[PDB]
Structure formats: structure tokens, C-alpha cells
Amino acid sequence: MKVNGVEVEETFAEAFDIKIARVLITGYDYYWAWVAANEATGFGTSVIMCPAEAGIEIKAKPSETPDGRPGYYIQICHMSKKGLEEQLLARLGQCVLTAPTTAVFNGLPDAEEKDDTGFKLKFFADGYQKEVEVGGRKCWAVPMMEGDFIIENDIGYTNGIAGGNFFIMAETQPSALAAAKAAVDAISDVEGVITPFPGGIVASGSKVGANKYKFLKASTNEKFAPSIRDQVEGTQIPAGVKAVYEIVINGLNADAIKEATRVGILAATKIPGVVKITAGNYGGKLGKHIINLNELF
Amino acid sequence: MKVNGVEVEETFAEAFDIKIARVLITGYDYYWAWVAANEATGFGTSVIMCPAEAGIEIKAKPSETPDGRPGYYIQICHMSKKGLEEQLLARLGQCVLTAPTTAVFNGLPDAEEKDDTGFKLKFFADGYQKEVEVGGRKCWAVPMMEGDFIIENDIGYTNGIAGGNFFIMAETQPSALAAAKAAVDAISDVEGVITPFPGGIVASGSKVGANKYKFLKASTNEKFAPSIRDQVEGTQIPAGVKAVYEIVINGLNADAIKEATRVGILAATKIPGVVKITAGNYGGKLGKHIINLNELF
Amino acid sequence: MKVNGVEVEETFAEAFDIKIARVLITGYDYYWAWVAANEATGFGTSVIMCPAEAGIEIKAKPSETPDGRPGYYIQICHMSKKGLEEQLLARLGQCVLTAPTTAVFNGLPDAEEKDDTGFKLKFFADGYQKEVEVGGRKCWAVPMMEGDFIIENDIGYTNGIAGGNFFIMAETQPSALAAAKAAVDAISDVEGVITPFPGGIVASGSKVGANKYKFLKASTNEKFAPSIRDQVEGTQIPAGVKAVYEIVINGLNADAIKEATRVGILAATKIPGVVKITAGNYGGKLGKHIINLNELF
Amino acid sequence: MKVNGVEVEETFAEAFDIKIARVLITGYDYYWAWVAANEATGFGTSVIMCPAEAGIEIKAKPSETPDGRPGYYIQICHMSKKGLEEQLLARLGQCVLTAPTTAVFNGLPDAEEKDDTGFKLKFFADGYQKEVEVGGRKCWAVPMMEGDFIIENDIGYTNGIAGGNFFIMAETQPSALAAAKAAVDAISDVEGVITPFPGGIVASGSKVGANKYKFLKASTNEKFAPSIRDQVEGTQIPAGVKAVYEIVINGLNADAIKEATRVGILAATKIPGVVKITAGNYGGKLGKHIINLNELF
Ligand SMILES: [K+]
Ligand SMILES: [K+]
Ligand SMILES: [K+]
Ligand SMILES: [K+]
Ligand SMILES: [K+]
Ligand SMILES: [K+]
Ligand SMILES: [K+]
Ligand SMILES: [K+]
Ligand SMILES: [K+]
Ligand SMILES: [K+]
Ligand SMILES: [K+]
Ligand SMILES: [K+]
């Protein structure tokens, strides 16, 4: 299979179920809204060793927000409900309630399940909290240094997907990295999705467990490490490839992960030096969500 | 005291003791280094509910790096040795070892005490790791998708200070925010320091524990909340002040904290609308380090 | 008349006729496309002393571009046809054909009037040009150091409007500025419009000639200068106002100018400290296009 | 010759004499100072068809400016005195005097040759002009909408150099581009120099006249165009190079150009895929300034 003149292996990505809450952060302008979102979603690449998986989803124009100001929608992910509930409180309470000019609202107003993050954080007012309605949302005003911080009572969450992905293989590292940046920019416009790794790009890659150091939970996936292909049997790196990068995608549903994957691949293949596009899986075992690349075009 | 025509209260900031590790991250250019530093230092405003207090210290020119590539020094802070070693492994292992083009070196080559974070993280190579020396530093090469990740064997840490600060009072919110942003920019050029909060700015402010909710580790500092000055008897908000913002500073030592405080105030007072400058403190024997504002100007 | 609680004067803006060309610039990703668009539209705030009035209109998603890669649409304006053709060849030839990874396409495909800028610039190939069709567009490939620069044969231009506007009055300079920045951000999502001044904001403001220096083509509009209200008898500055900022808007048609004016004001009035909103005119004796604030809300 | 393992041809760069004025622009913070500098330095890549060659030189810290505010130093270049005098009036009067919060000062106080830019632009005040002294500099306050614009009345200039350069050849377009990017970032820290092309990088390149279209004053240097190497018959592009990027350097003196050239090359050779490093000249006849690469290392 070829896409934009680039070879795309007819294989699949294997994803997993995960809980995801969608939050809307607004501010004076996009800069301040972003300052808060970025801080609240850092240290959030993988649940392997990060408190959660998080990222900025998409910008929100004044015409679409409750208070009529510019903002950003962000996603915070965790394997368990209580875990996600815990992440929302810590991240929004330590990184957004404390950020300049911010106000937070529910990013999934029609969600089945929701947690009372607003009700809990408002206790920060130590008794001076007030109740207010902003564009129809029921909120709380928390008096503090800059003025009144406004936060909706609840935040909705849903059963999403984590681990959507695709690999980019190229002739040099720069070519692979530029293809990966293109993919991330392209994916940034896709609603309902995020790319949690640094800059949204994975430079490491991984395999469950290890072959030598059994005391590890995950190690380098030597079969996709170009610098040691001569030393690895059954290596998946072609003779002309010197570098590989992966794009990991978390999303509210399968259709969104699928669109993100197509959009990302389409853009990546525009960069000279790209040799091959494929994706990572676990042989059909472990995963519950499978994305077949040949079904994307 | 008067600085640039503005009223500065002759009081003090009450800082606390904290462990600080200094890490140098390099990459192709400033953008890629920043991407790694940014991800690794997020969700790190306060130890009250964040896994640590982190932030970008200063830009590192190629002329000053072991590999001759552009980079950034970052600081990761924690109250104890185990937690810091812990945060170093998690943030660097999940946010820097995974980010494109990066290499990590000891940001405090000197310093007696250090953690062997490099030695532990190299196990990720599962036996394919190799020793290599870069710019006179003992590092490890970890094969992965992008190529080889280079990391020094050890990272140094020292007894630093967290909690240096000053408050900015203005006639309107935008005026207080503009001065706060001006302070953050000026402080960015100061070596050995970081401003942990979002955008480096504190919009909330906190006090003892709580009046009504003793189940809170901290609550709003109502005495500095202009929106409720009326129903507050010991309010520290002068009549015409409608907004306040705080700047928290963490750093390697007192001289650095004092420099950052001085530089931030000088810049803050250039903004129209600023009426008063002060600092926050508590019980004498509660915070070890005191920073008297009257000794900085 | 009040908007969001802020008073809006029931007056009008007086704009003028101008020629406008719309160009699409694409690259590896948004950064590189922005690099070219930013350089090409610089030194272009006003026709009084700049070679032209220009600016970045809006983002162009990969799904909307002829080549499927990210980009930005920009507008370049001039009073005459000859002057506009000249500015297209100079700005695109010197600032886009020379920038990394770009390609340029016709941003107004259905316009009847066009300039053959592509045809002229391709001579730079000195005999090595080659014709190529991209996404249905007739183009030329120009080999140079980086590879081949792709540029459509021509660019469409239309009769647009310059000078759409509104003034923002506030209690402090930071308040008026934050409001203006809020409006610029909101207006950045509006199609068919550009905000030509630095950061899209007018900090000066001007009037036809000059009372004391008749050799000037324009001078400060004293009736709107806060700092000297006590020395100007016809001052239009209310008592509590210390700073004013203007937002100038150029665009393809009246409906666009109108939408931008409306969205800008809505955003601006969300900033604390804003006291009044109005607009600039010249008695209706100069501009053909009048924008009544009354009809926007 | 080898630098960081990369082959560096033992040739030279051939530069020319040009008039350069240095201007300091300050604002509330680095963001606002940048907005004005950016706008004022755009549409300025080459005097061939641009009004001038301009760019941002280096950041200016509060401790270094006359008003104690953050800012940026920019360079505006022109071949003649009067052309330079005019470019200062237009760019600064149209792009800085109009940008939010700015103040301008002389960037070369010790230069005997100076232009009275400030004295002429203050006529904008139409009589309400007022003299003020800031940090020892003699300036003018010009009343306007945002308040009072402060500008020193004189701006110095000197006989500088235009055309410093070196070429980066790589196996892929992304490889050469990342190399040139790194070089620009590395040069941004060098005092007294600027990189005038888009993002500071030249993707085109050129030769004096033309081989086929003689009415042209310049055209593609086909001997350095990778895409037509099989054709040229005089190509200077080695078999394995697919793309080339050039970095043009302008500066106050020779020492500075050399430092910038050295700094750029060193950083560029750090990027994987770079094959060769050389520079552009004209047989040593056209330009007066020669920079031999072999004497920089
Ligand atoms: K807040
Ligand atoms: K997205
Ligand atoms: K993240
Ligand atoms: K890495
Ligand atoms: K710092
Ligand atoms: K932080
Ligand atoms: K180009
Ligand atoms: K727009
Ligand atoms: K412009
Ligand atoms: K100004
Ligand atoms: K420089
Ligand atoms: K330039």
C-alpha cells in the first residue's frame, strides 16, 4: 500500500481502554489560556511512570465558550475512575486555579458520568465561595489574589482510547523528526484527540518487559532501534533507515483515533526522506482496540 | 521604601528548605531542548499537591555544553532525597529520554552529593547500552527508535530554597498581570533560579491551613483578596487596589533568591497602575530563610 | 448602548477603498509557513509610509491546501493596481521564494482579476523551470539550493476595504492593552480580515494633516490623547480614562469588516478596566464605507 | 579540513560594505519589545528588491537599557547614508512609534556618525511634543492614544558588512534545514550580527546575472541546485547531497562576522546527515571582505 508515494505497511495499531475527562480553560486571550493548559498537562506522557496521560486538544473560540472568552480544551487520562478523579483535582487545583485570568468549565457537558471537581476545589475559598451562572453553566466564584476564580461544578469524563499510533521511518534523523512534527501539527486540528508525548512525539519506543533485565516493566524495543539493527535478529529496520519516530494518540472514541491517524500519516508523507510508515501492536493480545492502516485510505 | 516611584513595603518573604537537582538538557536547537524541558517540568507548581516543584532555569549556549549543542538547565525540587531521586527518574525517564534529539548531562558538575539517575535509566537499553564520554563527562548510550540517547551517569543536587517571593498590587487586574509578566521575564535571565508557577505567576495565594475547613492543607489568603476586603477585618488590601499577583521563586541559594527578588521588583514597577509591592511571610520559626526587601534596594 | 456592561458610543468608523491580493503559503508545518508569511507581511502597517499594508489572515489546514501541507493565507494591500503587482513580486520574490520549504498558491481562486506573479518570478530559474499541476493548480517548479520552489502561475486580487476600526478606552494602559490584545486574538479567527499594525494594535492613532506642521501627511490625534487632555479643548477623552488603543481592520468586503469589528469589541469588553468603546471617522466626507456600531449589536 | 567530523572546504566567503544603524526598542516585557522589532525588521531580506536589510540582533536585559525595561537591539542596513536615514524614519515611525508600550534609544551611543531620527519623528506631536531625559539619553515624549512615546533624538550608524555566509550540504532537505536552524539559533546569541533572511535562512541562493534571461539582474545559481545536478554539467553538488541551505550574516565588523560564521558552522555540524560545509564568493573581485573558513578553526 502506498500513500502520497510512500510505502505504508498493511499492519495495525493496538490500543487500550482508558478514562478521559475533557476540560475547557478560558482566559483573557489564547496566550494566558495556553499558559494554564500547558502547565496542567505536563509530566503526562505515559501512565507507565507519569501521574496520568494528558495534553491540549484544541483551541476554543470566544463564540463557543460559556463566558465568551478565548480558550483551550485539554484531556486528562487515567486507567481508573478514582485515579482520574484524583488527577483532575491536583492538576486543575495546582496548575489552573493558580494560573492568571483562568476560568474552567466542563468540556463534556452531555457526558453520562461526571465528577464534582468544581464543588471540591471551591472549598479553597475557606468560606467566601459564591455561586454563579455563566452562560448557563452552574459555577462557583473562588475569591483570591487576582480576583474571583470561576469554575463549573462538575467535569464530564468518558471511556476513551489510549495508545493509537503509527511509526515513521526515514533516511536520516532530521527527516524522521520533521515528518513527525508535521504529523503533530496536522493532528492538532483534529477534534477529540491529543498527542501526550513531548511535543507530541515519541523518540524512544518500547516493548513490554525485557530480555536481559527481567526486573524491568518495559525496555527499549531493540527490533526498531536502527543503531543496533546489525546486532538484533529479526530486526524490523530496513537497510536504508537510520531513524524512527512514533506518534501516540489518545482520544474520546475510535472514529477520532482513526481520523487522527490518517491526518497524521497524510502530512508525514509530505516530508522528503521518509522511507516507510507502519505501526506498533502486540500481536493482537493485550489490546482491545485495533486500527488497521489499510482501512484508513 | 520607594522603587521607581512605587511604594514597596519594608517587610520580608519567609522561604523554606528544599532539595534541588540541576539538569542540563540539549537537543538540535533551542526549540527541541525547550520541548523536553517544558514537558519534564510541568505539573510542578507546588509540593502541596504536585509531585515536585520544577521549572526552566536558563538557556545554555552551545559554547557552554558538553556536546556543543544548544540547551536548557532545569531545576526539579522535592522536600526529601528519596522523593527527588524519585522525581528525577520519572520526569527524565518519561519526558526527556522520550523526547526527540535530547541528551542529558549533570547541571551541577560540582556538588558532592548526586544520584545515579543515568546508570539506572540506561538499563532501559536491556543490555545494548554502551559507555561513551562526551566533553569529559562519563555517559551512557541507550539505543532506541530515534538513535542513541546520551545521558551522564550522575546528576548533582543541593540544599536549595523554595518560597522566595513578592506580591504585586494594582488598580486593575491587567495592570497587576502586566507587571507580574514583566517580573517573570526579567527573572528568566537570573542564574540559579526558577519561577515554579504557571507562566511563573501566582494568581491565587495561600495561607496557614483554613478557618472553616481544617481538612485542607492550605486555603485562600483572604487578607490579600481584593474582592472581599470589606468582609475581611485584617485585610492587607489598601482601598484603591482591585488585583494582586504573587511571584514565587525557588533556587540554589540565598544570594540567587535575593537577586531574583530585586530584579523582579525593579521590572514590575515599570508598569502603569502598580500601587504597592510587598512579600508574604508567616511564623518566624516556620520558615528558615528570611529575605528582607529593605536590603535589596 | 452597552455591550457586556461596557458603554459603546453610537457612532461610526469611516474606512477607505483599497486593492487586496490574497496569497496562500505552505511549508513542512505551521512554523515554517509562519516564518515566510511573517517576513513577507512585515514593514506593512500603513500606506502613509510603508510599501504596503499586509498581514496574516488565518491558518490553512492541510485538508484545505492544494498540496495537502499546512499553511497560512496572507493579504497584501495597495491603493493602485501597479503598486499591488509590484508589492506581490517584491514581497513574495524576496521573502517567500527564499524561505525554507515553502510553496505559494492563489489565495483567491475565483477572483476575476489576477496578476501573473508566478509567471514572472519563475524566470529566476533561468531556463530550468518546469510546469507542474498541483491539486488542480497550474504551477511552476523553480530549482534552487533547497530543491524546487513551487508557485502558482497567478494570484487573484479584489477591491477591498482598509481602515475598518474601533477605539478602546480604559482606566490604565495595561487594561486598554490587554483588551486590544484580546480583540486581536478574537479577530484572528475571522475569515477575510487582517489587523495590519504591530501585533495588530494601533498605539498611536492619527488625523488628516496637522495644525502646526502642514508638511506632515498625518499627525497625532490630540483629541484622543489621554496624557494631554487638560491642554486640548475639544478632547474626546472621558475623565477617568488614561489610555486608548485602536484596532485597524483591512478586508475583502464590508460583511467581513463588520464581523471583525463586532467580534473584536465583544472580546475587548471582557477585560477589566475598559471604560468606553467608540470609533474613528472624518465626518463621512472622506471614506465611502461607513461602519455603524449601532448595527453590530 | 574537518570540523566535528564534517568536511569543511578550504574556501572563503566574500562580503560587501554596507551602512548599518543599531536601534534599541524596549517595552513592558520581551514579548511586546519583540512585536515592534519583528514588524520593523520584516520585508528586509536583501537590498536587491527590499527597502533594506534588517533583523533582530540580540536581546537587551533590563540592567542594560536606558529605561530599565526589557528590549531588543535591531539592525537596519542600506548601501547609502540617505537611504539609511529614510529607512529609519519609515520603519520606526510606521512600525515602532505605533506599536504598544515601546520606547526607542540609540543603539550605538559611541558612534560619531548619527541620524536625528528622534528629532524628526517627534513632529508627530503637532506641538504637544516635550523634552525628557532618560538614563542620560536626551529624548522626546510624543503624546498619542496609548500615552507618551519616548524616543532619543539621535540614532548612530557605522560602516558594516553585508554578505557573510557559509553553505550547508546534506543528504536530505530536512537534514540541511535542521542544520541551518541550529546555526541560526547559535548565531542569535552572537553580539553585533543579524541573519536577515526568513527565519535567518536562505533556501534559494543566487548568481549575479543569468545565462539565458539576460534582462535579469540575478537568478538561480544552477551549480548549487541539487535537483538539476545530473543536468548542469558544472555542478558543485556532490553525488550524495540532496539539499543546500545558506546562512547570510550582516554585522558591525569583521571580527563579528567571523565569530558568527564559526559559531554557526560548529552548531550545524552537530546535525545528522550533514555532508559538507563551504561558502559563497565571487572570485575575490566583487566584494571587499573575505572570510576564509580555514582560519576560523
Ligand atoms: K485563576
Ligand atoms: K487535537
Ligand atoms: K503531555
Ligand atoms: K531522547
Ligand atoms: K531564571
Ligand atoms: K512548573
Ligand atoms: K522556497
Ligand atoms: K483574521
Ligand atoms: K503588518
Ligand atoms: K509606541
Ligand atoms: K545575533
Ligand atoms: K529580515
Helix/strand/coil (H/E/C) assignment for every residue in chain A? CEECCEEECCCEEEEEEEEEEEEEEECCCHHHHHHHHHHHHCCCCCCCCCCCEEEEEEEECHHHCCCCCCEEEEEEEECCHHHHHHHHHHHHHHHCCCCCCCEEEECCCCCCEEECHHHHHHHHHCCCCEEEEECCEEEEEEECCCCEEEEECCEEEEEEEEEEEEEEEECCHHHHHHHHHHHHHHHCCCCCEECCCHHHCECCCCEEECCCCCCCCEECCHHHCHHHCCCCCCCCCCCCCCEEEEEEEEECCHHHHHHHHHHHHHHHCCCCCEEEEECCCCCCCCCCEEEEHHHCC
Smallest Cα–Cα separation from A49: which of A165, A204, A186?
A204
Say how many C-beta atoms besides its own lie within 10 A of residue A127's C-beta. Answer: 15
What is the distance in angstroms between the CA of the first residue and the CA of the last residue of chain D? 9
Q: Which is nearest to D102 in space by CA: D113, D112, D91, D116?
A: D91
**DSSP one-letter code for B236:** -
Placement of cell 478632547 in the chain: C235
Q: Which of residues A162, A186, A221 is at a domain's end?
A: A162
What distance in Å separates the CA atoms of residue A96 and residue D72, rounded to the nearest whole number? 31
- How far apart (Å, rounded) are the C-alpha atoms in residues B58 and A35? 18
> What are the cell numbers at A37?
493548559
User: Does residue D204 sit in the same domain as residue D177?
Assistant: yes
Q: Which residue of C has its CA nearest to B171?
A: C172
Question: Pairing state of beta strands C155-170 and C274-278?
Answer: antiparallel
Nearest to D71 by CA among D125, D34, D120, D124: D34
**Which numbered ligand comes closest to the C-alpha of C252?**
8
Backbone angles phi, psi at A162, to 5 degrees: -125, 145
Residues 6+ apart with CB under 8 A from D21: D75, D76, D77, D84, D88, D107, D108, D115, D155, D156, D157
Could you give the 3-state DSSP secondary structure of residue B254?
helix
Pair (C130, C207) in one structural domain: no
B104 and B223: one domain? no
Same domain for B147 and B190? no
Query: Are B70 and D266 a contacting pair at CB < 8 A?
Result: no
Residue length of chain D: 297
Q: How far apart are CA D66 and CA A178, in angstroms?
A: 42
- CA–CA dist B108, A38 (Å, integer): 27
Cα separation, B50 vs A96, whole angstroms:
12
- In angstroms, the CA D136 to CA B187 distance is 25
**Which letter does DSSP use for residue D261 in this model?**
H
The grid coordinates of residue B85 equal: 531521586
Contacts of B270 (CB under 8 A, 6+ apart): B4, B179, B182, D28, D67, D68, D69
Write down which residue in D127, D142, D162 finishes a domain: D162
- CA–CA dist C29, D174 (Å, integer): 12
Resolution (A): 2.0
Q: Residue A274 is placed in which grid cell? A: 521518509
**Identity (one letter) of the amino acid at D49?**
M
Q: Which residues contact A82 (CB under 8 A, 6 or more apart)?
A: none
Per-residue CA distances from B111 to A175, B159, B252, B256 (Å): 40, 10, 11, 17
Type of residue numbered C205: G
* CATH number, domain with residue C104: 3.30.70.520
Q: Is A130 exposed, middle or buried (0-12, 13-18, 19+ CB in 10 A)?
A: middle
Query: Rounded distance, CA D94 to CA D121, Å?
Result: 10
Residue A277 CA to residue A297 CA, distance in Å, equals 13
Distance from residue D47's CA to the centre of ligand 7 (Å): 18
Across the interface, whether the CB atoms of A68 and C270 are under 8 A apart is answered yes
Number of domains in chain B: 2
Query: How distant, in Å, are the alpha carbons of A94, B42, B198, C204 from that of A39?
Result: 9, 5, 6, 36
User: C283 with C267, same domain?
Assistant: yes
CA-based nearest residue to B153, from B103, B84, B106: B106
Whether residue B142 is found in the same domain as residue B190: no
Helix (H, G, I), strand (E, B) or coil at B68: coil
**What CA–CA distance (Å, rounded) separates C85 from D128?**
40
Cα–Cα nearest to D103, from D42, D160, D60, D164: D60
Report the alpha-carbon distance of residue D75 to residue D160 in Å, rounded: 10
| Domain encompassing residue C93 | 17-162
Claim to verify: residue D51 and residue D1 sit in the same structural domain: no
8 A C-beta contact, residue C152 and residue C104? yes
Give alpha helix (H) positions in D96-130.
117-121
User: What angle separates helix B81-95 from helix B30-41, to the nearest 10 degrees?
Assistant: 130
Residue D47 is classified by DSSP as T
Contact A73, A57 (CB under 8 A): yes
> Of D28, D115, B242, nearest to C171 (Cα)?
B242
Q: Number of C-alpha atoms within 13 angstroms, CB side, residue B246?
A: 27
Question: In terms of domains, do B22 and B105 share one?
Answer: yes
| DSSP label at residue B22 | E
- Residues in Cβ contact with A297 at an 8 Å cutoff, skipping those fewer than 6 apart: A1, A3, A262
Helix, coil or strand: residue B270: coil
Q: Checking DSSP bridges between strand A218-219 and strand A155-170, what pairing results, if any?
A: unpaired
Q: And the C-alpha cell for C217?
A: 501627511
- Domain boundary residue, one of D146, D162, D178: D162
Grid coordinates of B62: 552551545
Ligand 9 center to residue C45 CA distance, Å? 5
Q: How would DSSP label each residue in C71-140?
A: EEEEEEEESSHHHHHHHHHHHHHHHTTTSTT-EEEES-TT-S-EE-HHHHHGGGGTT--EEEEETTEEEE
Q: Would you state the torsion angle of the CA atoms of residues D131, D134, D137, D141, taken in this order, to the nearest 10 degrees? A: -30
- Subunits close to B (at least 3 CB pairs below 8 A): A, C, D
Task: Please count the other Cβ atoms lying within 10 Å of the Cβ belonging to residue A81.
Answer: 14
List of E strands, chain C: 2-3, 6-8, 12-26, 53-60, 71-78, 103-106, 114-115, 130-134, 137-143, 148-152, 155-170, 193-194, 206-207, 219-220, 243-251, 274-278, 289-292
Distance CA C208, CA B185 (A): 39
| C-beta of residue A278 within 8 angstroms of C-beta of residue A169 | yes
Other C-beta atoms closer than 10 Å to the C-beta of D171 total 21
Breaks in chain B (C–N beyond 2.5 Å) sit after none
Q: Looking at the structure, do residues B39 and B171 belong to the same domain, yes or no?
A: no
Q: Tell me how long chain C is.
A: 297
Note whether D153 and D168 are same-domain residues. Answer: no
Subunits with 3+ Cβ pairs within 8 Å of A are B, C, D
CA–chain centroid gap for A269, Å, is: 22
Nearest ligand to the C-alpha atom of residue D164? 11
Verify that C266 and C158 share a domain, yes or no.
no
Q: Measure the CA angle with vertex D288, ends D286 and D291; round to 5°.
A: 105
Q: Across the interface, do C273 and B173 touch by the CB < 8 Å criterion?
A: yes
Q: Which helix (H) or strand (E) holds B225?
A: none
In a shared domain, residues D21 and D158? yes
Cβ-Cβ pairs closer than 8 A, B with C, add up to 47
In the chain, the amino acid numbered A183 is A
The region, left, alpha or beta by phi > 0 then psi within -120 to 50, assigned to residue C233 is alpha
Place of cell 490587554: C178
- Let me know the angle formed at the C-alpha of D285 by D281 and D291, rounded to the nearest 5 degrees: 45
Please give the residue of chain A at the shortest CA–CA distance from B76: A43
**Distance of alpha carbon D30 from alpha carbon C124, whole angstroms:** 39
Question: Which residue in A30, A171, A181, A245 has the most chain D C-beta atoms within 10 A of its own C-beta, making it the best mutation to test that interface?
Answer: A171
* Side-chain half-sphere CA neighbours of B13 within 13 A: 28
